[PDB]
């Protein structure tokens, strides 16, 4: 449950889940990826559809 914030210090997502890391070229064991681990919370307003 880490809050993901933008450059404006606003919480835009909530991330929680299980880390997946690769199991002589050793893999990076201090960095992992979570697929679908973050759920969005805020929606950025857009002008799309306005104007010509």
């Amino acid at each position: 449950m880490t809050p993901l914030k933008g450059v404006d210090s606003q919480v835009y997502a909530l991330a929680q889940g299980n880390i997946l890391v690769g199991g002589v070229q050793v893999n990076q064991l201090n960095g992992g990826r979570i697929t679908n681990g973050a759920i969005i919370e805020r929606e950025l307003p857009t002008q799309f559809g306005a104007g010509n």
Binding site: V7, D8, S9, Q10
Partner: protein, 58 residues
């Protein structure tokens, strides 16, 4: 507030409402001195207490 805020900077004040801490630690000291002196002393003497007969005129 929607403003942008850097992550790694030292969070210095940037706008009108920002607050800053001031440590006075003021210390000033100035001194001035002057002196002058002048001394003159003189003292002259002359006396016979015994005058020759030939010099009694002067």
């Amino acid at each position: 507030n929607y403003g942008y805020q850097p992550l790694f900077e030292d969070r210095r004040p940037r706008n009108i409402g920002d607050t800053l801490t001031i440590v006075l630690q003021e210390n000033v000291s100035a001194s001035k001195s002057s002196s002058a002196n002048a001394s003159r002393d003189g003292k002259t003497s002359f006396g016979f207490d015994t005058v020759p007969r030939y010099l009694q005129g002067l």
